[PDB]
C-alpha cells in the first residue's frame, strides 16, 4: 500500500524506488512542482519542512534512510541477524555520509569544487571494496549472502558517481563486478531502462 | 573485562548519546581515549573503515559510525520501540535529530561567529518537530515514541542538552521538551552519570567551542 511523495528528481528517493520496483512492489508517484511546494500548504504539514514522505497504509513517515530501514525491515532486507543488521546500518551510514558530501558539491560548490572531489574520490570508495572483499571474495552483496536496502542505496550512490566522475570505479574490481551483478536483476534492470528513471534528473539544480 | 569498548578522542561529541544510553542502562563498557598526536601519527586512521572515530566493539564486533553504534545498541537492549511502527519513528526521529546535529556541527566548527546569530533564530523552527511529535504522543508524558525509552531519545536528549549551553532557554519556547530533558535528565543512573567526572570533565567539541 505505498505512496511516494517527492520532486520530479531521482535524488534521495532514487533508491527506494529501485528497492520497490526490485521488491516487486507497486507504489504511487505523488508528484510536487515549484508552485505547489512554494504555497506553502504541504511544507507546513511535512513533519521537518521536507520531502520524501511516504505513505504505508495508516503510517507516514519523512527522512529517506526511515523509508529504507522501514522497507528494509518488513521485506526483510536488514540482514539475516542482528550482527548482520550492525554491518547494513555501517554501510548505510558510509553511504549517507558520501551522499551527504555529493550533494554539498552539486548544489552548494560544483564549480571549483568538482576537481578536488573527484581527486578525494577513490579513497571514498575504498571502504566499500574492501567491505565485499571481506564478504565471501565480494561474489553477493554488500553484506551477508542476501540483499538488504543499503545495497539498493549503494547501487544507488555509485551510478550517480560514474555520471559525475565516469571510470570512478575501474580501479575497484568488487565494485564493478557488483554493480553489474545487481543491474542485471531483472527487475531492477527494466526499471533502470525504464522512462520514470531515465527521464527524471539526478538532481534539481540539473547538475550531475 | 566489559563486553563494550569505546574508542574516541577525549571530547563528550559524538559518543554522548551513546554513553548516557550505557550509562542508563547499567552496561559497563571501556573507554579507550585517542589524542590528536596518536591520529596525526596516521596508522589508526588507517585501520578505521571510513578512517574516522569513533570505533566501537562489542566482542569482535567493530562497528564505526555513531548512529549505527546507537541502533545495535537499540536492537540489542530493546530500545527500538514495541512493534515495526514504532521501530520506524524512532528511526525518523532519529534522522531529524542527526539532520541538526550535522547543523550543529557545522556551526561549531567551520562558522561559529559569522553563523552563529542566524543558527539560533533559526532553532526555534527546527526544534518544533520533536516539540510536536511529544505532543502527539501521550501529551508528552512519557518518551519520543511509544511508552518505553528507545535509543533516539537518548540521541534527542543529548542533541538538546548541547543547544541549551549554545544558546540557553532556547527550550523556553517549547514546554514538552524541556518537561521531556529535565524528566530524563532526572533518571537515577543518567542523573549519576551526566553529574560524573568523565562526563563533566569532557568537552562537547574538540575546538573548545560550545
Ligand atoms: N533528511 C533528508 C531530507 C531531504 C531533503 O534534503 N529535502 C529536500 C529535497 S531532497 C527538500 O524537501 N527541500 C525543499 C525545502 O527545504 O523546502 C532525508 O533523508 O529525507
Ligand atoms: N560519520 C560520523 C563519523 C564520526 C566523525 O565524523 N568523526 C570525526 C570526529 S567527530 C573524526 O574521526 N575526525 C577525524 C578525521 O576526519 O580524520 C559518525 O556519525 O560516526
Known amino acids: 500500500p505505498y505512496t511516494v511523495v517527492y520532486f520530479p528528481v531521482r535524488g534521495r528517493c532514487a ?3 529501485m528497492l520497490l520496483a526490485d521488491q516487486g512492489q507497486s507504489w504511487k508517484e505523488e508528484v510536487v512542482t515549484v508552485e505547489t511546494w512554494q504555497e506553502g500548504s504541504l511544507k507546513a ?4 519542512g521536507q520531502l520524501p514522505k511516504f505513505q504505508d497504509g495508516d503510517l507516514t513517515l519523512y527522512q529517506s534512510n526511515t523509508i529504507l530501514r522501514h522497507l528494509g525491515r518488513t521485506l526483510g532486507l536488514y540482514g539475516k541477524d542482528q550482527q548482520e543488521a550492525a554491518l547494513v546500518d555501517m554501510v548505510n ?7 551527504c558530501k555529493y550533494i ?3 548544489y552548494t560548490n560544483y564549480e571549483a569544487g568538482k576537481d578536488d572531489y573527484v581527486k578525494a574520490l577513490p579513497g ?3 571502504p566499500f571494496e574492501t567491505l565485499l572483499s571481506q564478504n565471501q571474495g565480494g561474489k553477493t552483496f554488500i553484506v551477508g549472502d542476501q540483499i538488504s536496502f543499503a ?8 551510478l550517480i558517481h560514474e555520471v559525475l566522475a565516469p571510470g570512478c570505479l575501474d580501479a575497484f574490481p568488487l565494485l564493478s563486478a557488483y554493480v553489474g551483478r ?21 538532481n534539481g539544480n540539473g547538475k550531475q
Open 151 to 158: 545495497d539498493y542505496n549503494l547501487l544507488d550512490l555509485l
Open 45 to 48: 504539514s511535512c513533519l521537518y
Open 104 to 106: 554539498s558539491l552539486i
Open 15 to 17: 533508491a527506494l524506488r
Open 124 to 126: 571514498q570508495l575504498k
Open 93 to 99: 551510514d558510509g553511504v549517507e555520509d558520501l551522499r
Open 182 to 202: 545487481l543491474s542485471a536483476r531483472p527487475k531492477l534492470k527494466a526499471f533502470l531502462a525504464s522512462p520514470e528513471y531515465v527521464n527524471l534528473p539526478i
